[PDB]
Symmetry: D2
């Protein structure tokens, strides 16, 4: 006896259906196909007794539009619950705030996002928290590096900007047996390519700014928790630290998430062809893309990546920094010379003076951010226009 | 001598690149990759002499965000210029307002969009303007129906909701020879499948609400003009009618247009599979989709449609109206029972009681909207969820 | 037995309370103190039978956020119902579209808003509608000018930009006995100063752009109807012409209307002091403000204006157009040299080359838009900064 | 030699002018009177050399709309610079994060905002930071409580919800002599009533949610710094914490700040009248408002408060908790029973079960939140509707 507005009972909706409809039904009051934007601070209570009977009191704590996005994200990432934040850094900082105390040790990937690296080194370390930056490419490095004071292992795959991979399943099995919390930043992957919670991760952190949005429109962060206990701690501390996502940002992201599968398919198809083109180019030294046959962690990429190998690639121009700068300054439209990634608009970044400018050169070269190192975020433009643009820039390099 | 931020001189961006970047450059003041939202009524003038030296005065006349979208839409549709409106109906009535006067004749497709039919019959006819509703499937019907008083031939392809095609190139040749304005409503097609301006149409009307948006988010209309003289007349009357698009709507549509190609490709692939499924179902009498062999105008569809056959399909359920209603009442999620189309969310409607209810039964049967006729807007959900839903709904009909 | 969330029975809330709370209760679903933004095209229906059971189908026809604003505006203006439009011109054009047909005569104030004047002359007159521009300052002029074909009398008070007044009560009594529709554009007045529906007007038209908004934020129009019959005709034709206000604009205006009383009180207090200052200035020829004792229609102003005499004033600089241009070019911040009015930001406009540039000089001088004629919209800045700015500009004139 | 669009050199705009125009000029590109909304994550760079030549790179670090609001807030509060945050709690925790380390001591008012109390006690205390809660009504309590480890003295005036005053000038003198940072939360005051930076405070924290917004529309926080050195530390850590305000929130707050003076004047006039009414009501035990003679700190209120005594008042209903609850349950419209304050909409709350429920009864009585204690946020409705509502509610207590 299923009528209009009901799902078929005992059917799990397929992946793409969840991206379109996840966590959202038509507005009960009006039938509005999209959830209305609760651009609203406070919620009126029926009485003192029925406090929070309608589930809302204050937008810093929870907001109906934000909760809709959180339900969708929790379904897509395969988690118990999600908390949405003003930014990805807010999401990351909340993890470090909640699960680390003075005396605690934290293993972080040495090729973590520059922001995650700095907020560990230049802030949370002042609370006598020891962050140790190690190579996550070999899971035994993680297992051997775990101390009695280790509370959190913070993986990132692919890594910003070197695109190093971490065996999330193998690291998760090590963290389970050692009773350590495994947090994974899968911003570069998206849940369409890799869901760390499916591979035994305790917590996933997303910069929704990048691919979730994918339109260079909004800042956003998400923490997706494997358990209620972890979710409740994140939720409690988000309310205290006042870094929740806004209703308007949640509305934008609810809209953009709908097309993430078709966007990432197109970006990844463009990225494959661009990586192949760059790998044949006589003025390109190295190309890094998980999808080209020369990728050093090809076997882990093939085990861990579903559907695609992503929109992110990196390469090095022959002739060091000078050639890198010449190319960068001569990369024409439709390319954009700027920070960020994961957008419909193709972006070319130089991580040395943009994103990892606060890292010492000796340290930048140690991790793999080399002299002429270019990070590329592939958009959904015609791939021939993108290759034309790179070919011109490389000719001028 | 071309640096970053410049297009290569003498090169034209390819189709998908125009959807991403068309009519938009980074903000000259800040470098903002997206153009800022000019949520702003009035513009300060440097002096009385330098009035409109910066190109803006009042947002009813023109707004920078709206102009950015208009430049993109003009590039995508292949027109001299575009004017953006609050709705597709606003765009349509501005055409009727500008180009028709008492004693003038207007030929309109008899299977026009319901609202277009009504704004003609129930409003503009009171100004002694003669609207004649004819079958556009045979171009010689148009040639033979044109009078000395005929100012506008108003085609729609595919037609709402019967999906009849009009030979835009043949009708354009007739209209040029008789020196009549050929206006084409290509809302159902999108410029990704068919650009009427490329086929000799003088004006294109779009409901940007449908596919341009494709997220059920905003109302909008566009008029794309072949010439400066037509564009200037539409621009002038828009300022008078006060039916310009808002900056916020234009920003939304600037974002959603970027993914129109990948959305329409996905919707069209789903539609092909759904049309094939319905064509073999014993409770389905007829299926209308330009991409299946049973389509009456397959020759014109193959000549006129680029890339895809679109996200719109129709079918007739056996057992007439009662069966149609029983089916509609039992169409489960992820289907939405509502008006509108072209969205990521799959939509199903019975045009007899929703959109074409003001047309008496005798005439709605005469045009092609039969008793059990269903209009289907295919979204980007997993096609197996959409087919399973239609299959269950059909079991109750 | 009144609980929290209920009004006291048999109590009419006072004026300022209606500006804050009019047409809006907490969201039934969540208790959200502000109504959520229905940024949404279409509404899902329960079944074919319960079509429109939740009151919404398509946002071009009606939207929940727009309906909330319409309820507030109808209460504030003292009307049966209100329809909100994309712009004030859209509201005006819809009145002319609905209530005028070929052969019909329409009496308009010769000092009507430039846009209203042009849309009558340069558009609707092509439908063989006769617009006669007469002096509305004497109500007997209106009574004597009424022909057998007169369907609409279109008053404006105060007039843009000359601030001439029309006796709305006297014109209403003439229109009732002659069976003619009385439409009043009270944009310049606001319902806080003058409600034409209270003075027997059949229809009020508002540019909500000006004072309703009062922040230079949004474009908007409102038609407030005295009867259901008139409201239903406006509503029907708004849906056909697709010129409805957007949910986002309605949300902005719901927010800004809350402070209209305190804004207009402050603007009017500043305007009184500025008008007094200008009336004493040795380089100012004439000052027009309904609140200064020299105002030619002082007696009608005192009868017709409640609370205030408005934020709009006008003056003429001695030395003709050259002195007018010198002053205009030397008016410093916090003044803004631009079009529009009614905003928190003080605006100075020259109607000759800004707003009435399409009117012949001989015609501009005939109506009272003289050589050195300045229109002033007074904001809520410190009046001493505004006077300082004018005094400097006048010194340079 | 000053033309239109320029401030007169050597003149400072007066108070109300700064609220309207502060930190904002017409858009240099278009002349847009309001600054456009930079709904935009990343900013394109001209070259590698000219990195940040246009002042922006990534919206987590800085955004043009947010910077415009920060310049306005810095001017209004009389600070070197301001940083804007997602919430007031984000602003508060950024102060604690930046200026406290393990072994450091922090003096906080014992009648602080509930959330501020909890973020100290239940989070930052885990970093071995000693928070001591003392009575700020006597400045010698602060002087005697300061240790060699004291880095921050965190005052709040008026205090939430008891409306106790702190002598900001006296506490500032003590803090300067002991070289301790004086941070003042003046959310309840607004800069229209009290600017702590003028009284020697090193940092001001604002919940812009409350009075800056005043429309129950947006969440927001501001940190206004006395010096560049303090500002740079707050700016740096905001980028790390990822708790910056969104461009859309900043646009809303840029608009609402314009009317703060006229809003607060109206709210304060209503509050005075409500406080006087409650002070004579037989069912009211105590009334707390700085503007009535019974206010314990009337001497400090007259010295410290400019223009008004604010929109916040408190009272104790006779018959303890039961009576308080019966009253709250029967407070009619236009009152709203909810959390938050400072809005156009009058708000009433029992802080025992809403805001200060996590504080055990023994301590909440010790600080001043008595059994029948009611916090009242007075809006801009007609005062007779607000008094009639309180009168009815009191009849049921
Ligand atoms: C961008 C990014 C972040 C930080 O997210 P924001 O939204 O920029 O604060 C964290 N991790 C990775 C991998 C990122 O790319
Ligand atoms: C929807 C539609 C219109 C009208 O557009 P609105 O945005 O709804 O006003 C016109 N033509 C066609 C073919 C449509 O589908
Ligand atoms: C501005 C104005 C209008 C037109 O309204 P818009 O919102 O600008 O379309 C009409 N009448 C008067 C008196 C006006 O001032
Ligand atoms: C509300 C409030 C805060 C916290 O601000 P949010 O915007 O709610 O995070 C801090 N201090 C005071 C005095 C407040 O009233």
């Amino acid at each position: 006896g299923v009528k209009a507005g009901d799902w078929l009972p005992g059917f799990t909706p397929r992946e793409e259906t969840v991206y379109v409809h996840g966590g959202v039904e038509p507005d009960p009051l009006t039938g509005a196909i999209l959830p209305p934007i609760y651009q609203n601070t406070t919620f009126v209570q029926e009485s003192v007794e029925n406090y929070l009977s309608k589930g809302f009191s204050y937008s810093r704590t929870s907001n109906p539009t934000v909760l809709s996005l959180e339900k969708k994200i929790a379904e897509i990432e395969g988690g118990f619950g999600a908390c949405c934040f003003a930014t990805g850094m807010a999401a990351t900082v909340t993890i470090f705030s909640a699960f680390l105390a003075p005396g605690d040790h934290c293993l972080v990937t040495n090729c973590s996002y520059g922001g995650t690296n700095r907020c560990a080194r230049l802030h949370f370390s002042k609370y006598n928290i020891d962050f140790e930056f190690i190579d996550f490419r070999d899971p035994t490095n993680v297992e051997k590096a775990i101390r009695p004071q280790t509370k959190v292992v913070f993986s990132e795959s692919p890594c910003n900007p070197t695109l190093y991979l971490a065996d999330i399943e193998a690291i998760s099995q090590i963290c389970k047996e050692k009773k350590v919390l495994h947090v994974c930043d899968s911003t570069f992957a998206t849940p369409y390519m890799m869901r760390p919670l499916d591979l035994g991760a305790d917590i996933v952190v997303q910069s929704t700014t990048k691919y979730y949005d994918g339109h260079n429109c909004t800042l956003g962060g998400a923490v997706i928790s494997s358990t209620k206990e972890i979710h409740d701690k994140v939720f409690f501390l988000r309310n205290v630290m006042g870094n929740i996502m806004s209703a308007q940002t949640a509305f934008y992201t609810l809209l953009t998430l709908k097309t993430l599968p078709i966007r990432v398919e197109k970006q990844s198809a463009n990225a494959q062809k661009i990586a192949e083109f760059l790998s044949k180019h006589h003025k390109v030294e190295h190309v890094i893309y998980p999808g080209i046959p020369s990728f050093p962690q090809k076997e882990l990429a093939l085990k861990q990546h579903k559907n695609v190998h992503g929109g992110m690639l990196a390469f090095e121009v022959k002739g060091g920094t000078e050639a890198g700068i010449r190319m960068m300054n001569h990369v024409p439209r439709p390319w954009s010379l700027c920070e960020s990634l994961g957008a419909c608009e193709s972006i070319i970044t130089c991580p040395a003076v943009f994103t990892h400018a606060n890292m010492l050169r000796e340290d930048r070269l140690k991790v793999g951010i080399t002299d002429g190192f270019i990070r590329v975020s592939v958009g959904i433009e015609d791939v021939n226009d993108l290759i034309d643009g790179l070919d011109y820039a490389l000719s001028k390099a």
